[PDB]
From a paper:
To extend on the structural repertoire of importin α structures, we tested whether these ARM repeats are similar in the structures of importin α isoforms that do not contain bound cargo. Comparison of the cargo-free and W NLS-bound forms of importin α1 showed that the structures were remarkably similar with an r.m.s.d of 0.180 Å across 408 residues, and importantly, the positioning of ARM repeats 7 and 8 remain unchanged. These results suggest that ARMs 7 and 8 do not undergo conformational changes to accommodate binding of the W NLS in either importin α1 or α3. We superimposed importin α1 structures bound to a variety of NLSs including monopartite and bipartite, NLSs within domains including CAP80, and BiMax, and found that in all structures the importin α1 C-terminal ARM repeats 7 and 8 were in the same position. Similarly, superposition of a variety of importin α3 structures confirmed these regions are highly similar in all structures and allow for favourable binding. This supports the notion that the positioning of these ARM regions, highly similar across a wide range of structures, is conducive to high affinity binding of W in importin α3, but not importin α1.
Active transport of proteins from the cytoplasm to the nucleus is mediated by a family of nuclear transport receptors known as importins (or karyopherins), together with a number of ancillary proteins including nucleoporins and Ran1–3. Importin α is constructed from an N-terminal importin β-binding (IBB) domain and a C-terminal NLS binding domain featuring ten armadillo (ARM)-repeat motifs. The W proteins of henipaviruses share a common N-terminal domain with P and V proteins, but have a unique NLS bearing C-terminal domain that is recognised preferentially by importins α3 and α4 (KPNA4 and KPNA3), rather than the better characterised importin α1 (KPNA2). In this study, we present high-resolution structures of importin α isoform adaptors bound to the NLS regions of HeV W and NiV W, providing insights into the molecular basis of importin α isoform specificity.
Author numbering: 72 to 497
Amino acid sequence: GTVNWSVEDIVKGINSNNLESQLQATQAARKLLSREKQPPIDNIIRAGLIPKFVSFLGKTDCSPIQFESAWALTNIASGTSEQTKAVVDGGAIPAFISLLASPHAHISEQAVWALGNIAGDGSAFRDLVIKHGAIDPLLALLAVPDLSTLACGYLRNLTWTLSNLCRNKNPAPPLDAVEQILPTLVRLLHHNDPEVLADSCWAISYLTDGPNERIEMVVKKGVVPQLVKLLGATELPIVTPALRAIGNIVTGTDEQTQKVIDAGALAVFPSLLTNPKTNIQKEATWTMSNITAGRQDQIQQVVNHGLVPFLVGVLSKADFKTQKEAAWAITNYTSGGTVEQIVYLVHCGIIEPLMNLLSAKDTKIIQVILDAISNIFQAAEKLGETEKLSIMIEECGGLDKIEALQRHENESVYKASLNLIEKYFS
């Protein structure tokens, strides 16, 4: 009967000179801490029990107390940063790393879970877990010919912890550790379990969220085609991180963006740009905005795949944040695109939704839309057709909005709008 003990009784049991009494009290503590209704984590910490749990981690001759104390410590380390810090300050990191090699799979799984929580807290604890030498034994746990012979939950916990070692910025994980972990992530990215795939995609999205050198580390391993395939998954928990990784990658150079395009990503965007999940739509439109900031042949790839009508659609009706990403996409398209491509954009109906967005209460989207209008007018000048575009803008109500913006609080707004009026509506 280790259910519902008081903290005083747990302390009495853990301070007894009786390994079995200590074990029973430790299990009682684990059960307290694993209740979803406000676990008394802080009371356990104040009782001074973390050092006792950490010392129990080292009793190889009593694996049950190793297991129970590991689980109690894991439940503490899954809370606030101060509670994770309490666990770390007790010396738990090297003890859990030593337990990674346990012959009891449940104990090593508990150690994997604990190190995942600790490393997930933040950059400093992540780098400290790495310094204590966790990566080698972690990856050795996965050194089997077929991942499918491992228990499902075990492999899932390993993948989650590895993703947490790839997580957080300022600073990003050490390049050495990233290189050490990447091959295993590449293997996990091909494993048939939705949760393993989701967490591998999350790890990749963490590693690609940075300068082009990190992106390049990831892209050199050849994972972009697999990322696109997973972009096409039906499980939203897979699509979300896969799309995040692809967007990150296209924030890089034009060659990395081209690697995304060559893998077939664009063919998936009709659905992504109409996805019923608002965040999928927003991230797909952000990815598109970065693609249309590339070379003219990449804008042309966007055109060939019939995605300009979907950007018109998103601009016309979507969550306002998605519409802002779409305005960005249009401004980049018009800034980098050929005359023919801007003409095509107009022929797809961009002008009316573009104008309708000028009544928004957001200054940045107004600046972006005015930049797009100026670029389109530049193309029209190059074609000597500013009157046609002026009439088009005037017929859908854009001229009223621009003349109203001429008197806007922001300096840039009234400047750009006055320029447009004087230049093409006089």
